[PDB]
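Key idea: predict the complex, not the pieces.
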Amino acid sequence: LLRRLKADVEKQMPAKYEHIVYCKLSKRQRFLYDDFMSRAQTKATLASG
Amino acid sequence: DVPVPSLLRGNLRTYQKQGLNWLASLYNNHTNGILADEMGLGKTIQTIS
Ligand SMILES: Nc1ncnc2c1ncn2[C@@H]1O[C@H](COP(=O)(O)OP(=O)(O)O)[C@@H](O)[C@H]1O
Ligand code: BEF
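Result:
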């Protein structure tokens, strides 16, 4: 193997931030989501299949 | 590591030169290994070198 990371070349590399942006589901997406959940329960969700 | 640079015309940094340093033990000893370096550190420059 040969492995190196940015820590050796660091302090010249700028910062890296991971943001998390939350977006609420829309109205028709809330209706369609629950619709697919119920219709999926009619198929027994196919979880163990 | 005693590299002869000729036809290197581009410029390489120190840790990549160490990449060729650790690459010198492969072909000279007839050994094959995986070189995995952090993305953005220019492995291709090491291969071309
Ligand atoms: N000596 C150097 N000086 C400046 N930039 C370099 C040098 N060596 C490599 N790079 C940059 O690093 C990048 C390396 O990309 P590449 O080797 O194709 O994939 P990766 O490095 O992610 O494996 C190139 O886009 C190049 O601009
Ligand atoms: F590892 Be680099 F992104 F090719």
